[PDB]
Ligand binder design. Structure first.
Ligand SMILES: Cc1ccsc1C(=O)O
Ligand SMILES: Cc1ccsc1C(=O)O
Ligand SMILES: [Zn+2]
Ligand SMILES: [Zn+2]
Ligand SMILES: [Zn+2]
Length: 455
């Protein structure tokens, strides 16, 4: 129960149009052999090219939808489509490229996967909705063997060069022509009734079938993301650090304490309705306010209807919606909403305009909808501190800022402690906003109300 067994049966019904006469009884072992690969009982870390649905989830940062549409079978040319939007045409002699022989097409393939995956994964997983031509064309750009390391580093090998006879990871594969030891998963194996467009369109309106190979590769990875993260949710799976994860989360916790602390001092609300995560703590532990919690897990499909969340006196005080994505927020709210459109290593394309935000855990977030914040306004940057002006020791330059709400800045000149803490909070703030998060507050929020908290 560790890897997908080669002796597992492979349903070949979806392959019998490109491959007429294919035996109904087939195993992964006979399929791989039929594809043109000799897996000579190698106990060297590569037991099967194909992988389980569970292993594919653990390696979602590696998912690349792959589809091959035979333009005219080694007699006819092939359109090679990928979920990166790329379409390469191979000749046997929405970026649509002209016909070229396999020996140049394979070099282009290694460049695209290396540039796409170098910052997200140690491997590639080809997400397939197999009809025959994609598995048979793999021998033209893929080499398999024992697990290896890069010739320039310690990472596992993902590419191979016939010119130099050496192996490399995604970072050092410049000039490499083969894809070494890739992984793959056929979505049609998961038990679907109907074609890719019928099944995909049941959940996604954002990807259209333009009848190009890349459009199918995109609908495939989309349907695979839906089945594993939108409808099935497993927040037990941990994901490795691949970027600023630790700083982004520490920033979110610092921002949350600051934003909520200031809203309670500015408008002195008597009750705070904490709507969201059931494992949440008071972000402002010393706060005078009556803190009441309401459990709601992160919605991965559609955004929560604010009516189905409330139907008890939510109009009294303020409502804290920290990463709790509702359809239209009440006027009396403090909100942090992840913006799914953000470009980052943590954010992977999602289903129906949503995104798969992978930071320790995979959170498929619904599409960012600007109309959710009609009764709110964008919360502006501000740094508030009521702590004493005590240094306790980096080199200084006098800080001048209107948004340093401190006793020292009220007094006229900001102390070194609040200047250091202001720039540290500005860095945590900018870190969080760039990671894709967006802050919104009730229209009455005015930081001018915080100057009177030191009197
Ligand atoms: C406010 C309240 C009280 C009992 S269930 C509920 C809800 O919001 O679902
Ligand atoms: C392991 C891991 C990955 C992202 S956050 C994190 C942690 O230790 O908090
Ligand atoms: Zn390397
Ligand atoms: Zn889609
Ligand atoms: Zn000060």
């Amino acid at each position: 129960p560790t890897h997908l067994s080669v002796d597992t049966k492979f349903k070949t019904e979806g392959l019998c149009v490109d491959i007429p006469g294919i035996p109904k009884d087939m195993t992964y072992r006979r399929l791989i052999s039929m594809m043109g690969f000799k897996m000579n009982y190698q106990v060297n870390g590569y037991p099967n090219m194909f992988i389980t649905r569970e292993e594919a989830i653990r390696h979602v940062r590696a998912w690349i939808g792959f589809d091959v549409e035979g333009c005219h079978g080694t007699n006819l040319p092939l359109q090679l489509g990928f979920s990166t939007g790329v379409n390469l045409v191979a000749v046997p002699t929405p970026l649509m490229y002209k016909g070229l022989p396999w020996n140049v097409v394979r070099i282009k393939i290694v460049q695209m996967l290396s540039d796409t995956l170098k910052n997200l994964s140690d491997r590639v997983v080809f997400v397939l909705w197999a009809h025959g031509f994609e598995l048979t064309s793999m021998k033209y750009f893929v080499k398999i063997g024992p697990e290896r390391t890069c010739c320039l580093c310690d990472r596992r090998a993902t590419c191979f060069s016939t010119a130099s006879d050496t192996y490399a990871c995604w970072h050092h594969s410049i000039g490499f022509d083969y894809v070494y030891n890739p992984f793959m998963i056929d979505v049609q194996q998961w038990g679907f009734t109907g074609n890719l467009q019928s099944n995909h369109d049941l959940y996604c309106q954002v990807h259209g079938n333009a009848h190009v190979a890349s459009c199918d590769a995109i609908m495939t990875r989309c349907l695979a993301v839906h089945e594993c993260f939108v409808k099935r949710v497993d927040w037990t799976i941990e994901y490795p650090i691949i970027g600023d994860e630790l700083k982004i989360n520490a920033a979110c916790r610092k921002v949350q304490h600051m934003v909520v602390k200031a809203a309670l001092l500015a408008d002195k609300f008597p009750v705070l309705h904490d709507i969201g995560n059931p494992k949440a703590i008071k972000c402002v532990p010393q706060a005078d306010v009556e803190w009441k919690f309401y459990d709601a897990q992160p919605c991965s499909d559609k955004a929560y209807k604010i009516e189905e969340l409330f139907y008890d006196k939510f109009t009294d005080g303020v409502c804290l919606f920290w990463n709790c994505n509702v359809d239209r927020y009440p006027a009396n709210s403090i909100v942090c909403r992840f913006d799914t459109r953000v470009l980052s290593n943590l954010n992977l394309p999602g289903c129906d305009g949503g995104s798969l935000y992978v930071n320790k855990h995979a959170f498929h977030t619904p599409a960012f909808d600007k109309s959710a914040f009609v009764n709110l306004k964008q919360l502006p940057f501000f740094y508030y501190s009521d702590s004493p002006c005590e240094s306790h020791g980096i080199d200084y330059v006098p800080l001048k800022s209107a948004t340093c709400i401190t006793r020292c800045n009220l007094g006229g000149a900001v102390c070194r402690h609040h200047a250091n803490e202001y720039r540290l909070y500005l860095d945590a703030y900018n870190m969080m906003i760039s990671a894709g998060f967006s802050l919104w507050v009730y229209k009455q929020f005015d930081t001018y109300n915080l100057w009177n908290t030191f009197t």
